[PDB]
């Protein structure tokens, strides 16, 4: 596969998603750029349906892999890039305990010359009180690490990790994430040995912004397979 060609430069990103979460229905649309290259992401998020009824924190993970920065030693473990530009799904359950779950379904892609992240959300048995849809996490995100092991019996990978949202009284919300990636097209994928994802987060407001919405840079590099010999 040559899809990795695709990101060595700037490249526009799209995300839409459509959420229902214990009935409270919700549309994100998000805009901005990434550089591969640099493993850095720049977008703004708007809820264009009104008033976010979860928290923006915890929305980060589902709302584009294929922007880490994989290390030249690493190339051929980059999963991602690989099924490009005819993309992949990408899939979650995200039990947060004592809490609900969400379950995702993206589809990360190329239309045109954008990168487009379209996902549906659905939230089941949350707590009306709870830490979520009572909105009582911090605005921010902890910097994390997140194995990926290949999945050969579906041509894909898989992840599991734990997000740790920080709650306002101090404690911690656990985001249990199983995650699991296919390709889209029927080409050819790389499967990665086991390595991960070092991810950072800062999240902020656009302060001419009125819209309920979320600014957010994130970095995503790839570790873990040892740069040995030659």
């Given at each position: 596969s040559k899809g990795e060609e695709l990101f060595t430069g700037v490249v526009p990103i799209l995300v839409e998603l459509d959420g229902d979460v214990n009935g409270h229905k919700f549309s994100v649309r998000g805009e901005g750029e990434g550089d591969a290259t640099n493993g850095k992401l720049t977008l703004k998020f708007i809820c264009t349906t009104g008033k976010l009824p979860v928290p923006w924190p915890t929305l980060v993970t589902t709302l584009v892999l294929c922007f880490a920065r994989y290390p030249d030693h690493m190339k051929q473990h980059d999963f991602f890039k690989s099924a490009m530009p005819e993309g992949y799904v990408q899939e979650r359950t995200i039990s947060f305990k004592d809490d609900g779950y969400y379950k995702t379904r993206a589809e990360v892609k190329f239309e045109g010359d954008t990168l487009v992240n379209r996902i549906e959300l659905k939230g089941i048995d949350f707590k009306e009180d709870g830490n979520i849809l009572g909105h009582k996490l911090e605005y921010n995100a902890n910097s994390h690490n997140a194995y990926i092991t290949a999945d050969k019996q579906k041509n894909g990978i898989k992840s599991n990790f734990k997000i740790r949202h920080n709650v306002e009284d101090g404690s911690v919300q656990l985001a249990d994430h199983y995650q699991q990636n296919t390709p889209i097209g029927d080409g050819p994928v790389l499967l990665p040995d086991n390595h991960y994802l070092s991810t950072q987060n800062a999240l902020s407001k656009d302060p001419?912004?009125?819209?309920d919405h979320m600014v957010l840079l994130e970095f995503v590099t790839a570790a873990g397979i040892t740069l040995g010999m030659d």
């Open positions: 001419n912004e009125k819209r």
